[PDB]
Ligand binder design. Structure first.
Ligand SMILES: Nc1ncnc2c1ncn2[C@@H]1O[C@H](COP(=O)(O)OP(=O)(O)CP(=O)(O)O)[C@@H](O)[C@H]1O
Length: 323
């Protein structure tokens, strides 16, 4: 039957049950890694770890009273942790609105548990969010900064697959994916390399800090611990291309094409990435170095509807030409 699609029936069931369409159609998942890789460049280990856990859950091999998966993402800033969490949410649960982000720097000071689960009688940021979206990816950023009382609430999620809030009502976490992140150790490695420390010192100091913050009792609860890697030159270039996608689409409305030389791509990659911030700088590098001067060319009439635009490097920055 052709006229009524799989999506038609899935949408009916989804609206009646609250189960996301992609969840209902999970089986009609074996290429989850390739789907995640459409947005997340590299970090193959993280993608495989997440995909492996989801498969074990779908195959009926895990404890049904725990979340679908739980992970600790270690490694540096700006290399794909949040991008993977956002992409996973969009892929598993149809929208990035299915990602719930808890910034643990806002939960450091003792009375923060009431912020998480609701003030005691006489609601909570986490509990209310998960009640209204049981099918969600939950991202806890910078977990080592959480107050112990807040950290104990995370342990409850991992152990019981549920939380009781301050109203006394149980909040179901069994359909969530829990992603915990920390950059712990990464600034220390940068400090050692700047100071000229030998690798042995750097290594030993990273392990003692990890030992201090992350104990086996905690870590044993997790599906996997994954250390994100710094990005290679080729990976940063692929990220530049992904980050030009929306610009190209907007330009294509006026039939304008952009053709970047390899040097122009390398210009953006060089400025858009560093060890401290990862690829966090790239968006505003593209805005400043490409979009702004392109805007001036369009407004001046030098770049017109229908033009193919060559983008190359000059010593003042990127330069433009229409052949
Ligand atoms: N592996 C990757 N694949 C695709 N894009 C990536 C990427 N790593 C970084 N980016 C780009 O750089 C930005 C920053 O990456 P991301 O948000 O994943 O880092 P992060 O989780 O460390 C952010 P924060 O420092 O705020 O916690 C993303 O919005 C994305 O555009």
């Amino acid at each position: 039957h052709m006229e009524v699609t799989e999506e038609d029936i899935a949408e009916i069931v989804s609206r009646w049950t609250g189960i996301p369409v992609s969840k209902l159609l999970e089986g009609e998942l074996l290429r989850l890694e390739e789907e995640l890789h459409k947005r997340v460049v590299g970090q193959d280990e993280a993608i495989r770890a997440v995909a492996d856990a989801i498969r074990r859950a779908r195959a009926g091999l895990k404890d049904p009273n725990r979340p679908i998966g739980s992970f600790l993402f270690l490694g540096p800033t700006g290399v794909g942790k949040t991008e993977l969490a956002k992409t996973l949410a969009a892929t598993l649960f149809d929208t990035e609105e299915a990602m719930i982000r808890i910034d643990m720097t806002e939960y450091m000071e003792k009375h923060a548990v009431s912020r998480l689960i609701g003030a005691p009688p006489g609601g909570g940021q986490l509990t209310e969010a998960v009640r209204r979206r049981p099918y969600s990816v939950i991202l806890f950023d910078e977990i080592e900064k959480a107050h112990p009382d807040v950290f104990n609430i995370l342990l409850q999620i991992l152990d019981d697959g549920r939380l009781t809030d301050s109203h006394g009502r149980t909040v179901d976490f069994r359909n969530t994916v829990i992603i915990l992140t920390s950059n712990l150790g990464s600034p220390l490695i940068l400090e050692g390399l700047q100071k000229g420390w030998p690798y042995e010192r750097i290594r030993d100091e990273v392990f003692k800090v990890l030992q201090q913050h992350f104990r086996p009792e905690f870590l044993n609860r997790l599906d996997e611990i994954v250390v994100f890697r710094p990005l290679t030159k080729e990976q940063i270039r692929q990220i530049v291309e992904i980050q030009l996608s929306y610009l190209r689409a907007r330009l294509a409305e006026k039939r304008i094409s952009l053709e970047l030389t390899e040097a122009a791509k390398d210009f953006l990659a060089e400025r858009g990435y560093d060890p401290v911030f990862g690829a966090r700088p790239l968006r505003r590098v593209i805005q400043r170095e490409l979009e702004t001067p392109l805007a001036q060319k369009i407004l001046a009439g030098e770049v017109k509807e229908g033009d193919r635009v060559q983008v190359d490097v000059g010593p003042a920055g990127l330069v433009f030409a229409v052949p």
